[PDB]
Design a binder for these strands. Structure first.
Ligand code: MN
Ligand code: MN
Ligand code: MN
Ligand code: MN
Ligand code: MN
Ligand code: MN
Ligand code: NA
Length: 325
DNA sequence: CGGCCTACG
DNA sequence: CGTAG
DNA sequence: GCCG
């Protein structure tokens, strides 16, 4: 089992769901306490289990697996023996964990803001609504729309949103294209948001495109919130006899950068962190959603496809549905 | 032990 | 500070 | 928390 998540297929559904979920609780808790290192180890350990071909049934089977040390092994051992891990359950029921989860899941609120509010004694969403002068416009939007934004986005929703984005993009720039990215490109049937990547086959014609797209969506009454290359929107999505708010991310890239942007925006988040770490540490190349840089020759790698990028990193190709690290 | 991805709004 | 995968 |  290779050490980096980008070196192994990780399907969306797998054989160790309960074990991975418990490790991901500890990862999330570590993030709420500012320990990105412990978050990463717990996330990586969970991801290893997702990549296994069958269920872990005995502690012996963790021997030699990367990212399983004393702590993560004990979590698995307790779940195997008792069906529950006291540490995990203590985290789950803790006021700190529940409140940090509630606050950080608000659009506009990160760990730093949630932590400050927690120390000020705030605990509920209505606590935040009582003092709205303290909130950013982004946070006010996240709070007004919080209920809808907590409701799963379905594939049928995604198809409807893609049609309206394509209509605005078509008027903004004939020939421009719209590609579904994020979790839905990896095969998820539901999600909490929708991600799109926009380009044009003629290099440079995409310049200035996102304002024109946003102006046209706004004029159609579809934008409940927006604040360029990346637009983090709340869309009004028609529903039977009503509508609901949906988070949509719109991203523009020139066609030269499109394979890097597609790779980056298809994720998963952990997969891309691991891929960038592998690139730099194992191959000495610097990767982001714009390109891949050789800092010795001081040159950028030209890519026409995601397959190109995997080849330039010496990695076997993984389709999106196997990037669910 | 140091590192832990790397951007944009 | 927030956002993104 | 774990790896190199
Ligand atoms: Mn420990
Ligand atoms: Mn026991
Ligand atoms: Mn997404
Ligand atoms: Mn998104
Ligand atoms: Mn750019
Ligand atoms: Mn150290
Ligand atoms: Na948030």
């Amino acid at each position: 089992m290779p050490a980096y998540a980008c070196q192994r297929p990780t399907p969306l559904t797998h054989h160790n769901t309960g074990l991975s979920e418990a490790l991901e609780i500890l990862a999330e808790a570590a993030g709420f306490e500012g320990s990105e290192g412990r978050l990463l180890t717990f996330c990586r350990a969970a991801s290893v289990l997702k990549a296994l071909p069958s269920p872990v049934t005995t502690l012996s089977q963790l021997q030699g697996l990367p990212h399983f040390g004393e702590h993560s092994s004990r979590v698995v051992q307790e779940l195997l023996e008792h069906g529950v891990c006291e540490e995990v359950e203590r985290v789950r029921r803790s006021e700190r964990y529940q409140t940090m989860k509630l606050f950080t899941q608000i659009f506009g609120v990160g760990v730093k803001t949630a932590d400050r509010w927690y120390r000020e004694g705030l605990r509920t969403l209505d606590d935040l609504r009582e003092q709205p002068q303290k909130l950013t416009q982004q946070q006010k939007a996240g709070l007004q729309h919080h209920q809808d934004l907590s409701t799963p986005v379905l594939r049928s929703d995604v198809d409807a949103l893609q049609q309206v984005v394509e209509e605005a993009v078509g008027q903004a720039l004939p020939g421009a294209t719209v590609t579904l990215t994020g979790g839905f490109r990896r095969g998820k049937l539901q999600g909490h948001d929708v991600d799109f990547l926009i380009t044009h086959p003629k290099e440079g014609q995409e310049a200035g495109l996102l304002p024109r797209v946003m102006c046209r969506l706004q004029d159609q009454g579809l934008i409940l919130y927006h604040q360029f290359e990346r637009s983090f929107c709340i869309f009004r999505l028609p529903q039977p006899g009503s509508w609901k708010a949906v988070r949509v991310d719109l991203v523009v890239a020139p066609v030269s950068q499109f394979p890097f942007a597609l790779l980056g925006w298809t994720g998963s988040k952990l997969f891309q962190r691991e891929l960038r770490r592998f690139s730099r540490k194992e191959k000495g190349l610097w990767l982001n959603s714009h390109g891949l840089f050789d800092p010795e020759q001081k040159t950028f790698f030209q890519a026409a496809s995601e397959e190109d990028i995997f080849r330039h990193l010496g990695l076997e190709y993984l389709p999106p549905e196997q990037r669910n690290a």
